[PDB]
From TrEMBL:
InterPro entries: Toxin_Ldr
Keyword terms: Membrane, Transmembrane, Transmembrane helix
Pfam family, one: Ldr_toxin
Organismal lineage: Bacteria, Pseudomonadati, Pseudomonadota, Gammaproteobacteria, Enterobacterales
Gene assigned in the entry: ldrD
Key word Transmembrane present: yes
Species for this entry: Escherichia coli
Entry protein name: Toxic polypeptide
Segments traversing the membrane: 14-31
């Protein structure tokens, strides 16, 4: 197995929930301003 080949897949896979999670808070915060 290659750490590099698993590096992109692992980083992208872990990043998916990381980016989506942070984005969720942003979207909600924006909507909270719309009242």
């Amino acid at each position: 197995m290659t750490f590099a080949e698993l590096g992109m897949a692992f980083w992208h896979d872990l990043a998916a929930p990381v980016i989506a999670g942070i984005l969720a808070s942003m979207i909600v915060n924006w909507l909270n301003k719309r009242k």
